[PDB]
Amino acid sequence: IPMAAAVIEEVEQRFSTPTALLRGIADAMVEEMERGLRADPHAPLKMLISYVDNLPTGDEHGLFYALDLGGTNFRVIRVQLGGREKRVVSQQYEEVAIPPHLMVGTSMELFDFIAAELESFVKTEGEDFHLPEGRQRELGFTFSFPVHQTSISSGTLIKWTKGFSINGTVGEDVVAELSRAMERQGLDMKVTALVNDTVGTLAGGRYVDNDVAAAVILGTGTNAAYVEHANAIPKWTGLLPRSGNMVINMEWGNFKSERLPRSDYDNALDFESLNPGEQIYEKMISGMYLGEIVRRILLKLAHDASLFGDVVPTKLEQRFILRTPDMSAMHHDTSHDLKHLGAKLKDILGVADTSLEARYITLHVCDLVAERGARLAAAGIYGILKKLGRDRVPQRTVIALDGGLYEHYKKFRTCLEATLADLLGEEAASSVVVKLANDGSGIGAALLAASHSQYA
Ligand SMILES: Nc1ncnc2c1ncn2[C@@H]1O[C@H](COP(=O)(O)OP(=O)(O)NP(=O)(O)O)[C@@H](O)[C@H]1O
Ligand SMILES: OC[C@H]1O[C@@H](O)[C@H](O)[C@@H](O)[C@@H]1O
Ligand SMILES: [Mg+2]
Q1: Which long-range contacts (CB under 8 A, 24 or more apart) does 122-127 make?
Q2: Could you say which of 78, 184, 377, 445 is the most buried, measured as most Cβ atoms within 10 Å of its Cβ?
Q3: Coiled-coil ranges per the record?
């Protein structure tokens, strides 16, 4: 009991997110949104111009391929599109898990593995897909890392995030990197668009619902994109676009702010991370990191309060051994003896048996960790709504979501929705909609490759 409670009291203190604070944080997010838009050097929110001035209409048609590369897997995709009525006539896809090594080897090894799937996936092309003879297959590239765009279809990698760390490629143009690798496979294809996963998901959403203003990811990582007025971007240099509109990638993963309620655990996780100092907000909320925070809190407990016996289990000292899908397993156990939770602990801590009070303390720790992440992510979405002036009534505003964290972690999902609504107040909340646009970055990129064909 009592040694355990001192450290839980300390977690509760440190992780606290009283709504008042959440609004504080939302505000800060907007300030930072503004600094990023002013080219303000070393703004933590980059607010990257996508070169996307037109989101999908509906009216798109043709064959288009997409390649979506993520934190933990990539997808190859095709769609046959038949205009405003028929729309999305046919679509296939393959998803492959990225091998750990390819996160941390060479650029070449990576895009080769990607391209090789793409190539073998194209072969299997049925005949409910077709493209005028003479013609070249075109391809939308979803790239789930922060790029500095140079055109719709070109851009240089700023920095790797969330478990990637490949030395060659920072500062290089990623589409050229893909292209070389594709052609090394004897694969005639063009990249006609290059987008972040948040942008893709915004395009996919808008294609089925015209009131989509924004898209958040909550998966291995977290990030958000929204449609911004081009005349509200000081660092814009050039001709304004016809639409009056530019989609921004906030890269809010990199938000930091004294207002963020952080712990030793968060400090230590960062210290031993692939990208120390970076993506500090993300590391409080996204899926690559939640299980690891839980582990570290449990490790303090096993040490300072014998929580799991007189010796701490070896396995509990392994970094990353407790993943976030395991965490949501434990979290959603409603049994009286917490059976299922216990089965997971046995498995992960490599222990034989568990106190039932120990099982209730684990569940509590899971609760605090997911709760902070979800409440903080809600503050971010509220931040966006503020930027769009849809935080108030005088209007239907849809926010597209994607990512396994959000799709599969039920309590994380509903904590985020309850809190968003709390922040918006009643009146304003009836205006906004959070909708699953799962695997939406993939299609969103094909759609945008359409608008930018070399053909009509
Ligand atoms: N059942 C689950 N409970 C909680 N989290 C989950 C669950 N399933 C998956 N996740 C998280 O979400 C991720 C699953 O893949 P996905 O959401 O497609 O992200 P990704 O494309 O690999 N990387 P990113 O593009 O940054 O989201 C994993 O990294 C997990 O951390
Ligand atoms: O996948 C969700 C997000 O993860 C973040 O950590 C990446 O830096 C973003 O580029 C991406 O949108
Ligand atoms: Mg994705």
Answers
A1: 122/65, 122/187, 122/189, 125/78, 126/92
A2: 445
A3: none
75 counts as catalytic: yes
- Total of domains in the chain: 2
Query: How many Å lie between the centroid of ligand 2 and the Cα of residue 71?
Result: 8
Q: 68 alpha carbon to ligand 2 midpoint, in Å?
A: 12
Triad 193, 195, 198: Cα angle to 5°: 150
**What Å resolution does this PDB entry report?**
2.8
**Cα separation, 206 vs 447, whole angstroms:** 11
- 419 Cβ partners below 8 Å, 6+ apart? 19, 22, 374, 375, 378, 379
Q: Are residues 253 and 368 in the same domain?
A: yes
- The angle, 0 to 180 degrees and rounded to 10, between the axes of the packed helices 107-123 and 174-183 is 60
Q: What angle do CA 262, 267, 270 make, to 5 degrees?
A: 120
Q: Which residues are in the CB-under-5-Å shell of ion ligand 3?
A: 70, 197, 441
Instruction: Please count the CA atoms within 13 angstroms of the CA of 201 that sit on its side-chain side.
Output: 29
Within this chain, do residues 68 and 33 fall inside the same structural domain, yes or no? no
What span, in angstroms and rounded, lies between the C-alpha atoms of 179 and 140? 12
Residue 55 neighbours by CB distance under 10 Å: 22
Cα radius of gyration (the chain): 23
**52 within 8 A of 195, measured Cβ to Cβ:** yes
Report the alpha-carbon distance of residue 234 to residue 156 in Å, rounded: 22
| 275 CB within 6 A, ligand 2 | no
* Residue 128 DSSP code: S
Give the whole-angstrom CA distance, residue 165 versus residue 167: 6
Contact 272, 77 (CB under 8 A): no
- Give yes or no: residues 79 and 139 share one domain: yes
Q: In which domain, by residue range, is 189 found?
A: 50-207+439-451
CA of 41 to the centre of ligand 1 (A): 32
